[PDB]
């Protein structure tokens, strides 16, 4: 009774399968994908984030030169220079005038904002995916429990124990490259470490917050402090991490493909519904009841009511209920024509009781299966009025014949009448 | 403490938001039409702006700033196809899929078009035969012209 | 002068490239890949490690039952029994001798090796390589810097900035799935966390050794104690991680493809020799030598003396130096044909200088690029005797004519026999 099930990769709807298991009483699923959770496998390649020129304070040697040296700081910028006369508090106060002497010195930090606002490059690779599969199951009506998608594990957690995909739709929404701000992901071909051109993202590129070292390309270049006064020219870029936030791209949770949510968290990308899933279960033997205790329900009818050709379970159905015995019947459509709001329906003597549904076909001929008995709930669909809300219950769109059956027919007789004028001439002919 | 734009003016058409919006503040608009096939949207909106957003069979969802996401389910709402007049109902058919049937109703013209063109030679043609067979005999008695009755007029025998 | 060059990706053996800017003097490069290791990206999937039936001491009702609970221990595996009189250094203690009851309780656990001594399953994508790439360069005589692969990172580490990869010989030894033990590493399909069967490997499945969760079906099943005496019958499978060590696989640095080593570090895998790796370098102006200051060598002559057909530098060659000024000259093999020991060779004033190398051809018409001057150094060469010794600086061997230029011209000759025999018949048909 493994009850191995194809299954669509859809966050917020259940999926009410029908365990037919020979021998006991068949029982219903209804399993709810909550969550699609991805967590691919990625690496910190560097954080970036705005510089900050944090200048040590110049030299200023009043009669000759200072010779600099290249300081291992990150883009440690220092130039020599002469021809100064330093107001300084008193009027200027080396008294030469062309030997004062001025060696500005700046090199890039990491911005205290680096810590906290910052951005964030990744090499992006597949992983694996997640869900809280809530199933209300059966009679044990609970159990909503996190597990993976790759088809050999399980998760004994309640009673039963599931099998998940591996799914068919490897479509990962990031990238493999990506950059990452506070919540906004941006699937981004980031240059790379070590590289980034001043101006453009990444000028600064630090490994980590904690990482010393750096790649700082900001073009930072000092130049000559004016008119005999202290202070340090410092001609640079602002950061790729300035721009970037305001002249970005937009969010792959707002640009994403097939309808996925982002979070800054484990780098998942939930609630991604395309493809599906071919999901099996071994329930608990013991949650099943015995063919022999539940009622037969046969020599029923079946027939729609109002139906609602919708996504919002508008359809509906009395049915002819003809039963031996008196209790729960657990229900289903084997076709996926429709989908039931009811997974179980209690049964009197032989009653009737009405159930709700969603469809897609005009005409829909869908089977359902009242605890081993079949019917044809045949019938005609009304459309609706009001379509602006959240997402659908129906997701079984199909090819959906009133000019098409003696239509393609009589097409067809045009040249069936062919070869029935043809070959005909044969015997006129002989 | 922060920021939040004015709520939006839900318009609905056939598979399409109308959406008279009137922002206090420029704000970016922003959509994910959630098939495999993206197609997001961007406009910071300053003016107050009416906008249309195709929105697809499976759902769109609609972000009015920092204002939660929307989502919304645009199924049909061109009426499907009841029928009791013989084909301008048919619209409603076509109102729901405008790429299929464009190409369905002209593969449906083209088949009888094949099946004209192969009718009529194996009509000319078997009209052409039957009567050569026939009218070249001329007088010819077989009172079963009645059989094609395009090629006509026997010898009264 | 961004030294574009395609190289092979080998690790123990020199690269020495020649860097021919127009217009000032040629620079010889010495690139040796010291190493390749990789680090692709992975992800720690869980530990295992053999269990611990770390029995929970069991408890002894006299007289009547007591019925155990599932606790949540891992595995916990409880059995109540009665039908004991358990001998417990008096005789027995309980006075009944039925309604003795006797619940025994296990649960597995983590092995204090479990920490140390453990196997370790990865989810195991592609990551980056890296190197400790040693560059003798010019004169600069010195850099051994770490750099990357991914074709647009520098490292200005010494003075020159050099750009590698992407590497086009993408195999990863390691495979998607991983096991890893100490040092020995499995490219092993483990089963996954949470499935793994009772006695195969992967029976304790921890995602950490902290975890206290984990997943272990080890088939625990209790029986009774024999004969009313204490103790617990503990039925178990020895564990998967007993077995795989003494039933394993043989590890990847032992069966891995194209030549790879391994280590218990990142997860690198060394030194993996294959294919080529598109480098480009910018070097520092400064280090290069106007053209106006090296010798002009032309006029001169080279030959080989000994050449040995061989992988050590076993060919030798005399050049008979034509000089302009003296000094030094850097050589280069433009044809990958010969591979030359010497980068630089000291000139005085048209003097004679012999230099080191190794070729495959046995008529080796390789150029020699003295110093801006030409000149095949043809000759012939001698197979040596003595081939026990690690590994070559040839690694040029390509296709190697004494019975095919005649003899396939000979061949053509019978069937250009052909059309002028026929054609002819042509002209004495007319």
């Known amino acids: 009774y493994e009850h191995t099930a194809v299954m669509p990769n859809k966050v917020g709807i259940p999926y009410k399968a029908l365990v037919e298991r020979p021998g006991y009483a ?109 199933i209300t199951y ?78 700082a390309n900001t073009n930072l270049k000092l130049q000559r402090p004016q008119a005999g006064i202290v202070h340090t020219p410092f001609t640079q870029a602002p950061s790729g991490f300035e721009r970037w936030k305001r002249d970005k791209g937009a969010p792959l949770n707002d640009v994403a493909p097939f309808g996925c949510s982002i979070a800054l968290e484990p780098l998942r ?35 729609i009511t109002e139906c609602t050709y919708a996504s919002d379970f508008g359809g509906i159905a009395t049915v002819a209920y003809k039963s031996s015995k008196a209790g729960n019947c657990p229900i289903h459509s084997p076709s996926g024509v429709a989908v039931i709001k ?34 044809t709930c045949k019938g005609d669909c009304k459309p609706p009025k009001d379509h602006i809300v959240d997402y659908p219950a129906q997701h079984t769109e199909s090819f959906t014949w009133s000019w098409l059956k003696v239509l393609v027919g009589g097409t067809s007789a045009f040249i069936v009448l062919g070869l029935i004028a043809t070959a005909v001439v044969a015997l006129v002919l002989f | 403490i922060a920021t939040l734009a004015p709520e939006p003016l839900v318009e609905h058409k056939h598979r399409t938001l109308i959406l008279h919006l009137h922002p206090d503040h420029p704000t970016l608009l ?65 109102n729901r899929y405008p790429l299929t049937t464009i190409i369905g109703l002209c593969t449906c013209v083209a088949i009888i078009m094949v099946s004209c063109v ?27 012209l009645l059989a094609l009755l395009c090629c006509i007029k026997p010898t009264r025998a």
């Open chain 1, 138 to 215: 059966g009679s044990v009506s609970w159990r909503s429990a996190d597990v993976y998608v790759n088809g050999e594990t399980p998760a004994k957690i309640g009673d039963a124990k599931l099998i998940i995909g591996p799914l068919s739709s490897a479509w990962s929404p990031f990238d493999n490259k990506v950059v990452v701000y506070g919540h906004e992901v941006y699937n981004y071909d980031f240059p790379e470490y070590g590289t980034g051109k001043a101006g453009s993202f990444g000028d600064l590129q630090s490994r980590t917050s904690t990482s010393n070292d750096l790649y």
């Open chain 2, 118 to 144: 192969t009718s009529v030679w194996l009509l000319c043609r078997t009209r052409n035969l039957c009567i050569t067979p026939y009218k070249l005999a001329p007088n010819a008695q077989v009172p079963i």
């Open chain 1, 342 to 375: 009811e997974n179980d329906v209690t049964l009197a003597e032989s009653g009737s009781f009405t159930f709700h549904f969603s469809t897609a076909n005009i005409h829909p001929a869908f089977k359902l299966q009242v605890c081993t008995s079949a019917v």
């Open chain 1, 269 to 303: 990308a939930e609630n991604c519904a395309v493809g599906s899933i071919p999901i099996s279960i071994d329930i608990p033997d013991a949650a099943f009841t015995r063919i022999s205790e539940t009622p037969t329900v046969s020599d029923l009818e079946c027939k």
């Open chain 1, 26 to 134: 068949p029982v219903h699923l209804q399993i709810q994908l909550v969550n699609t959770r991805i967590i691919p496998s990625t690496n910190l390649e560097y954080i970036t984030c705005k510089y900050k020129t944090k200048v040590p304070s110049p030299v200023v040697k009043c009669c000759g030169a200072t010779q600099c040296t290249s300081k291992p700081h990150p883009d440690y910028q220092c130039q020599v220079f002469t021809g100064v006369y330093p107001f300084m508090w008193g009027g200027a106060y080396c008294f030469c005038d062309t030997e004062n002497t001025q060696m500005s010195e700046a090199y890039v930090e990491r911005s205290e904002e680096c810590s906290i606002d910052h951005a964030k490059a990744y090499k992006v690779h597949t992983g694996t995916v997640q869900a809280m599969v809530n």
């Open chain 2, 30 to 94: 922003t959509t994910r039409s959630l098939g495999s096939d993206a197609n997001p949207t961007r406009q910071w909106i300053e003016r107050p702006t009416t906008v249309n957003f195709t929105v697809t069979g499976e759902g769109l969802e609609y972000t009015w700033g920092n204002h939660p996401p929307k989502r919304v389910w645009a199924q049909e709402s061109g009426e499907g196809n009841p029928h009791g007049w013989p084909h301008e109902v048919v619209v409603y058919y076509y």
